[PDB]
Each structure stands twice: as C-alpha cells, then as structure tokens.
C-alpha cells in the first residue's frame, strides 16, 4: 500500500507531470513488482522489481462466507426502458445476424448460507451481478469457504488485504508461490484465512471505510470479464 | 554399484571460526589467534593422493561424507598422513574384520589387524557391503545417518576430529528429483576436547556445528517455500547433551513433530524442516551453560528459481506474590537438606520468596482472579489451542519490572490489530511490558505448529517471560499451553529448578527474609544452593499430591522447564504409561522439552511422583499421587 498526502492508497494514479511523495512500509521480506496496471498491455513497460532484504540493526470479529463461482445467464437491461433511440442504445442490447445483444451467460460470485451450497443467502437488487458484500474491520477475519460451480477453474482473491493464508495451514498446496494465482477445481472447495491488519486500513485523514474488491485471479483478464467481481470494504473500530 | 572413495588423515591447524583455514586440506599437483592443531579426513580422487577435493565450507571438519546406496559395496582407502596412527571404523554397515578398524582380543590374523590402526604414512583399504538389512526399514527415511570414525583411541581419534558422515539409503540414490531445492545439510553437534586430543597428550571444550564455534559457518542456505533434510550426528567423549533448536521452526524426527531436537554422542537423526519464512533463523543449544553454547549457526532461507476454529479470550497478568514451595505444610527438622532448603535460617531465606508469575483473570478489569486448583502449582493458566484455532492473549504486567508472554511451539503470533512490531523492536519477544501496561497478542495455531498422526493428540508446549529468559524464568513466569488436533481432569506437571539466586526479588527475599540483610555473604555456596528449589510443579518435597480417583484414565502433561542443565529421567512410582504409542516406565526429559504420556490409573496406592536423577531427590524434586476409587 501506498501512504500519501496522508491517505492509504492501493496505486498510484499518475499522468504527466504529476509529483507525489509516497512512502510505503516493508514487512514481507522478498521481491515484489512495482508495475502500471492498465489493461493495455502496451501499459506494461512500466515494470520495476523492488527487492526488500534484511539490513543489520470491541473484540474483533470473524465472518463467515460461503461463496459460489457459479454461472448463471446474466441481463444487462432487464428494464423495459427501450424507444430512446437515435442514440446507441439498439446496438448493444439488440438479438440477430450477428449480435448476441444484451442476454450473455456469465459466472458470478454467489453467497451462500452453509457449507451445503444448496440454500442462497439473500441477494439484494441495485449490487446486481457483483458479488456478496464482503465487510470488515481492522483486527477481524474473514473465512472465505469458497467453492466453484462453473466450468473452467476459476478462484477468489481479496486486493486490499495483506495477510491471505489457507486456513488452519499457512503453506500452499503445490508448486504453488502464491495463493493468488493458485486454481480452484471440478467443484472443489478451498477454506481461506483473510485477516485485516492496520495496515489496510483508513488513516484517521480518509473515510471510516475504504472500497477494495475481490476477484478470480487464475486469469484476471478473462475472469474478471467473464463477471467475477464483487466489493470489499475495509473498516475502524468504535442503511 | 561399488563406490571408490579416497580418504587420508590431514593434519591441519584450526581455530573454529575461519572457513579460511580450510584451504590449506587442499592438495598439489606439485590471526587472530587461537588456532590448534588437529587433524580430520580429507576426500582425494587418485589412488595416488595428490587430488584434494576442497572442502565445502558449511561442512567444517567433517569427513567427506560417504554415501552408498543397499547392495553396494564401498572401497575406500585410508592413507594417514597425520602424525599419528588412525583407522576407519563405520557404523551402519557389514565388514569382515578386516575391513572393520578396531582393535581388540578378535582372535584374527595380524593382516586382519591391519584396518585395526594403520600408521602414518601407511594406507589401507576397507571393503564395506550394504547388505539387504542395512536398510532403510521402510518406515525410515530414503537414507540413513550413520558415521565413519578413526578408532584406535576414541577419545583422542574424536576429540582430534576423525569424524565424518556416512549415509546407507535405500534404492534410487541416484533417482534425482529436486535439484537444489530440497537441501540437504550434515550437522555435526560436537564438543572437541582440544585438550584431549592427539595435540599436547588447562586447554578448552569447544562447543561446535560441524567445528565452527560462534555463529560462524558459511553456507547454510534453503530453498524457501520447500524442506531441508538435515542428517545428524551428535559426537563427544564424554556423555554431555545438547537441545538443538531452530527459530521459528519445528523439526519432524522419526513420524513425531520434534520441536527440542534431543541429542548425545552418536545420536543418528534424520530431521526435516519445512521453510515457510524468508530470513535467517539461529540453530543453537538452550543448555543454560553458554559452555553448551558456542554451538550457533546461522540458517539463511532465500527464494530461488525454479470443525470450524475457536478463539479463545485470556486476560493473563504477570503479578507478584508471596509464594513458599513448602506450603507450611512441611515439617522440618535440624539436620540439613530440607532445613537448609527450607526452614528460615540465620542465613537462609529459608523457604518463603517473592515471586511474579502468570495468573488469569475473568475480564479486563483484572480486577477479580480467577480458579485455580491448587495441583497445577506455581503455574500460570492453562492455554489449549486445536489446530486453526486462535489465542488472544490480553496481557496486563502487574509487577515491578518489565516482563513479557511469548509462546514457545505456536509460530504465527503478532499483536491483535497490526503486523508492525512496535518501537524500535525486531522481534515480540524482545518487546518488554513496562509495568501497569496491557498489550494485546494473537497466538494463530497453524497445522505445522502441532500433532502429525503419528504423535499425541496435544502436543505439551510451554510459555513465559523472554525480556530475560533466564531471570524471569527463575523469578515464576511459566505457564502450560496445549496444542491439539480436532475432556478431562488435566493433569500438568513442570519439574522446575527455581534458582532463587537468580529472581530479581532475591534482592528483596534477602532483606524481607534474613535476620542479617546488612551482614549477608551472596556468595556462601551453601546459602546459595538454600535457594535452588527442585521443585516439581510449585512445591519442593511431597508438598505437592494429586488425588485421581481410582480408574480415571488420564493424561499427563509434563515439561522440564527451570535453570536445569542435565536431562530429567521422570518416574511414576506404581505405574507405566503410554508413550510413543508404547509403553514405558522412564519418560527422558531434556530441558526446555515436554512430553504427553497418556496413563489408566489402576493399581491403587499412594505412590511418589520423582525424577531418577537421587541428587535432585533428596532436594525436594518429589510429589506424591495418591490413588484410590470414589
Ligand atoms: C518489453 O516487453 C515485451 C517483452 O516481454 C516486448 O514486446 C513485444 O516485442 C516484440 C518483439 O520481441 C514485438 O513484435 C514485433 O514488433 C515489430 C515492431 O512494430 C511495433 O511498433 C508499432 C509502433 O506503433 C506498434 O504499433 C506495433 O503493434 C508493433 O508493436 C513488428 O514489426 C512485428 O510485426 C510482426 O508482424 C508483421 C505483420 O505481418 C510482420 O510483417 C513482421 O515481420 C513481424 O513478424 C512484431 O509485432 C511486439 O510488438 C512487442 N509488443 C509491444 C506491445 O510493443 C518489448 O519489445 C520489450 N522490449 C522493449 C519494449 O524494449
Ligand atoms: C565465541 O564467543 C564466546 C563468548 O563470547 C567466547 O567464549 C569466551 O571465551 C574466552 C576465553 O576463551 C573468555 O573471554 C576472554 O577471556 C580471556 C581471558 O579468559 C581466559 O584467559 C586466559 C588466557 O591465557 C586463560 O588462562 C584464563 O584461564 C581464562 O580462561 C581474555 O583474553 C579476553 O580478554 C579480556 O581480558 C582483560 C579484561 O580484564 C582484558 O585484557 C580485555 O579487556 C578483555 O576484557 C576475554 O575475557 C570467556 O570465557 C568467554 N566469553 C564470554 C562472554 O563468556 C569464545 O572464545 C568465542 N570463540 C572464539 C573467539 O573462537
Ligand atoms: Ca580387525
Ligand atoms: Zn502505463
Ligand atoms: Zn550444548
């Protein structure tokens, strides 16, 4: 994270002459890459490693979330709100010789009650499509049972928190450097452990919550286009 | 197949701390100080002997470390070019006395008593066969430790450094699989008598990995997120243990989670350790003599190429108190043990101390304490942890200086809110608490912390102060902590030499306790020992008795944890226990080492729970245990 004016900041948005002091703070010895994020790839000389190396000298929650990958036929305008149309409107959500239109299947993220995956908790119109609202403040734990129900491996990932171990081990399954980009199988179940530090959080100078997000990992891109996306905030303590 | 390998005894001077000093074991073709003379086995590649081979660093005075796989026959050939004469012994594996190296009354041809001292300048072959039962057993691992070691006289042969590593392994030596990934490593724990070797036959013991001294000794590097199997020879002449520890890790020994690593000379392990932490991690000896120090080494790990838990609330304060190991229930008498021990003399304190130690308390008000039971003596709280589940340790230092709760065998904890160490700090066990603060922990139990299937179902682990391991350990910081896998009475024992003249309230004990606190001599080796309490759980002399109810099958919980030094052989007058998954009657504790016998109480008297060890018996080290139904 990056700490400036005196906000935590998860990039540095930047253009032109723009002039920041940032600091930032290491606790993970290893090599980590500083690189520019924009989807064109092009966007991708701006690429540097950083390597960080020894030198010399009330009670907060857990939550709990069974969620789904899960795929199901996605409607961009479920809303009769058509006959404006000198303008665009036809050409994205139209049916025939060579438009899908506006009904695309889709996986999302979906919540479920317990470990079963037979009973939906409850979903909520207006978040349509994004995933279940993942909350929590600094110090608590969120158990994120998570299992797929698609049909390519797919995976659950929260960018925001530091600390993501399995559950119960703190060592990851294969030939596996890390558990980001790690997949989830034919209907598999993974149990992980997020727990949210300080150093995720707000900064007495920004808002009592930040807005972070969780998505698939196994191919970002794709998955993230196929749908899996959905929002995380990130909190202090004491509609 | 057959395996040649070329030795030849080297004499070279050595000074335990420069890998520097290894070239000169190198070979032709054609400051400060200290330094000794020894002499070791060095690799050739010729039957000519003029080819070294160099010495790796990390291995020190080792031998080159001959390895053969089951069905092999190995051809080595001495050549002593030391001072004096040597022999090639090799434990592990078949001989024909000929090529054994020991000589005794075998009643064999003086040919047959060539292997058996060769002499300098001379050479001989050794023909040793790795028959079909030299192996691995199955349930051991791919290889096995064994040694080679000159044996003409074993304590100058050792002591001089006539050592090194040999490993039977089953079939596929030679299979290949992870490529400097998975390292694997000899570590020689021994204590060369540079007094008592071939050299000067005043001088000193040195304490060494693999003969280097003080955290020297290049080279141990590990592959991170991946195990390192470490083969482990302990050596000496005279008895003399060792309790090898790593930071931050825990060993895996035979199928058992090993946190201690228990050794003594010609301990043969074969212990893995998976790295899941960049940095450097110090291996090192916890004897209490710093003269069983002197074996550290430095453990780099780098990155190379290619039913739902519980968290469980504790409100623990480190809290002073007037406490007597022999809860003026001990009658004395006038003659001496527990009279000196005990029984307030005109220069003995006697039996009553000042003390701090762990106590629990119902909420953070600290402000009401909370049970006891009174068996669990001295002892803080009791602190039980399945895998997965989390401690949150709210911690309040009631006392006088600062002290400090650190978990020994949970690996995962920082304070509740944040990663960051606070000030200045490196690491929280460092990290002292000024009187009268709280700071708040979080102990997170991972799977690598506790049972593997094949050892008990709660690992027996302890805590305590560690802004003076030592001191505050002497002055009654400790405390139980179970850590189990997914119930009864409980049943903890910690056999625990209180070294009163090291509690930082010895000072007050003196002036609250003796008649003469202007005129006390600190240094009477008898006042002195008037104040080491070999006490089993709180109490010295059968001050201490558990009642079990006859057939309640139990479960004990027993640590060695105190300013011992020496291992506590540990008995149980009536009964045997389940160890292991057998049976014994003697359950061996190194210090710093706890164990988890599981015991059916049934035959039905009043029995004498005690070490072994008669002189720490006869000062007190001894509880009582009555059984009888109910
Ligand atoms: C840093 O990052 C990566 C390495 O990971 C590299 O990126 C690609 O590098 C390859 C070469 O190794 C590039 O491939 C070739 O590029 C040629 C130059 O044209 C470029 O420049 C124009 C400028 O506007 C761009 O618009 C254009 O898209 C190209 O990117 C092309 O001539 C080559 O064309 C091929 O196809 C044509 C069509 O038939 C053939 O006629 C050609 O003979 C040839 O076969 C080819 O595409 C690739 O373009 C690079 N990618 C990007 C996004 O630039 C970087 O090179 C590396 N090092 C740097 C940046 O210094
Ligand atoms: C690894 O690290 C450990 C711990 O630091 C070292 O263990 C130390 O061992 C040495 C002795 O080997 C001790 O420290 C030094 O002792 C010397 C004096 O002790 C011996 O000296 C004579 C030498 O002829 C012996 O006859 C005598 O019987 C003692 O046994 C000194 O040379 C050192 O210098 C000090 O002396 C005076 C102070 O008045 C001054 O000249 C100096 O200022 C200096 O202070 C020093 O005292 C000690 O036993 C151990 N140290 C500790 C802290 O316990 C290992 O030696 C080391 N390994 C190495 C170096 O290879
Ligand atoms: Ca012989
Ligand atoms: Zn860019
Ligand atoms: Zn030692």
């Not at chain 1, 034919?186 to 807005?211: A, H, N, Q």
């Not at chain 1, 698939?216 to 891109?221: C, G, K, P, T, W």
């Not at chain 2, 691992?141 to 006539?162: E, I, M, Q």
């Not at chain 2, 200045?424 to 700071?439: A, N, R, S, T, Y």
Request: with cysteine; hydrophobic share 35%.
């Amino acid at each position: 994270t990056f700490l400036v004016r005196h906000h935590r900041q998860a990039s540095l948005e930047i253009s032109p002459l723009t002039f920041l002091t940032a600091q930032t703070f290491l606790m993970d010895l290893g090599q980590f890459l500083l690189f520019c994020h924009i989807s064109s790839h092009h966007h991708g000389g701006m690429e540097a490693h950083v390597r960080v190396e020894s030198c010399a000298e009330k009670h907060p929650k857990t939550w709990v979330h069974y969620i789904a990958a899960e795929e199901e036929d996605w409607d961009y305008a479920p809303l009769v709100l058509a006959p404006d149309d000198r303008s665009y409107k036809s050409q994205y959500l139209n049916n025939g010789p060579q438009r899908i239109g506006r009904k695309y299947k889709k996986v999302r993220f979906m919540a479920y009650t317990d470990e079963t995956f037979k009973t939906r908790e409850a979903i909520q119109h207006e978040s349509g499509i994004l995933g279940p609202l993942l909350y929590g403040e600094v110090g608590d734990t969120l158990l994120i049972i998570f299992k797929n129900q698609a049909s390519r491996p797919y995976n659950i990932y929260p960018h925001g928190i530091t600390d993501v171990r399995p559950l119960y081990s703190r060592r990851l399954p294969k030939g596996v450097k890390h558990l980001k980009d790690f997949p989830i199988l034919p209907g598999e179940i993974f149990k992980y452990k997020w727990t949210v530090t300080v150093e995720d959080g707000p900064t007495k100078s920004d808002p009592r919550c930040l807005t972070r997000y969780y998505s698939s990992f196994v191919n970002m891109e794709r998955d993230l286009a196929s749908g899996l996306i959905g929002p995380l905030l990130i909190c202090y303590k004491e509609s | 197949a057959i395996r040649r390998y070329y030795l030849g005894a080297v004499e070279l001077s050595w000074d335990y701390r420069q890998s520097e000093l290894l070239r000169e074991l190198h070979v032709d073709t054609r400051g400060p100080s200290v330094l000794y003379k020894k002499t070791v086995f060095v690799e050739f590649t010729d039957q000519l002997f003029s080819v070294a081979r160099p010495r790796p660093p990390w291995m020190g005075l080792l031998g080159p470390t001959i390895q053969a796989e089951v069905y092999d026959t190995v051809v080595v050939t001495l050549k002593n070019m030391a001072s004096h004469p040597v022999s090639l012994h090799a434990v592990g594996v078949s001989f024909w006395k000929s090529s054994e190296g020991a000589e005794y009354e075998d009643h064999t041809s003086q040919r047959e008593k060539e292997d058996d001292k060769v002499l300098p300048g001379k050479s001989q072959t050794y023909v040793w066969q790795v028959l079909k039962e030299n192996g691995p057993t199955a349930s051991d691992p791919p290889c096995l430790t064994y040694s080679y070691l000159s044996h003409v006289d074993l304590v100058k042969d050792l002591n001089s450094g006539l050592i090194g590593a040999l490993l039977v392994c089953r079939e596929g030596s030679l299979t290949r699989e992870r490529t400097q990934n998975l390292h694997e490593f000899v570590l020689l724990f021994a204590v060369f008598d540079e007094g008592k070797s071939w050299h000067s036959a005043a001088q000193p013991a040195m304490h060494t990995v693999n003969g280097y001294v003080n955290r020297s000794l290049p080279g141990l590097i590990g592959c991170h997120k991946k195990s390192v199997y470490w083969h482990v020879i302990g050596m000496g002449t005279s008895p003399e243990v060792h309790s090898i520890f790593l930071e931050g890790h825990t060993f895996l020994v035979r199928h058992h989670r090993q946190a201690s690593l228990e050794i003594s000379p010609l301990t043969f392990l074969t212990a893995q350790t998976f790295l899941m932490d960049l940095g450097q991690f110090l291996l090192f000896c916890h004897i209490s003599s710093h003269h069983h120090g002197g074996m550290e080494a430095h453990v780099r790990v780098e990155s190379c190429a290619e039913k739902h838990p519980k968290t469980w609330v504790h409100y623990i304060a480190a809290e002073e108190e007037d406490w007597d190991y022999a809860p003026l229930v001990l009658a004395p008498d006038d003659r001496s043990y527990k009279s000196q021990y005990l029984n307030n003399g005109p220069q003995r304190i006697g039996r009553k101390y000042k003390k701090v130690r762990f106590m629990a308390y119902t909420d953070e008000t600290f402000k009401t304490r909370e049970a006891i039971q009174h068996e669990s003596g001295i002892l803080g709280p009791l602190l039980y942890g399945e895998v997965g589940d989390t401690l949150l340790i709210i911690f309040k230092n009631q006392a006088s200086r600062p002290y400090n709760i650190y978990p020994h065998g949970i690996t995962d904890v920082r304070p509740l809110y944040s990663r960051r160490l606070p000030k200045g700090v490196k690491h929280l066990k460092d990290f002292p608490i000024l009187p009268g603060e709280i700071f708040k922990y979080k102990w997170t139990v991972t799977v690598e912390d506790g049972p593997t299937k094949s050892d008990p179902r709660c690992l027996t682990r302890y805590y305590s102060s560690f802004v003076n391991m030592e001191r505050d350990l002497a002055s009654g910081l400790i405390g139980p902590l179970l850590i189990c896998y997914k119930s009864d009475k409980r049943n903890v024992i910690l056999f625990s030499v209180f070294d009163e003249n090291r509690s930082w309230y010895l000072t007050e004990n003196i002036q609250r306790f003796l008649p003469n606190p202007a005129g006390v001599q600190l240094e009477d080796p008898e006042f002195q020992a008037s104040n080491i309490m070999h006490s089993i759980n709180g109490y010295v002399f059968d001050s201490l008795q558990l009642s079990v109810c006859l057939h309640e099958v139990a479960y004990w919980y027993i640590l060695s944890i105190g300013a011992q030094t020496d291992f506590l052989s540990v008995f149980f007058s009536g009964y045997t226990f389940k160890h292991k998954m057998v049976y014994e009657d003697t359950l061996t504790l190194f210090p710093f080492s706890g164990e988890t016998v599981f015991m059916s109480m049934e035959n039905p008297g009043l029995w004498i729970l005690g070490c072994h060890n008669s002189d720490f018996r006869n000062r007190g080290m001894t509880a009582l245990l009555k059984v009888s139904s109910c």
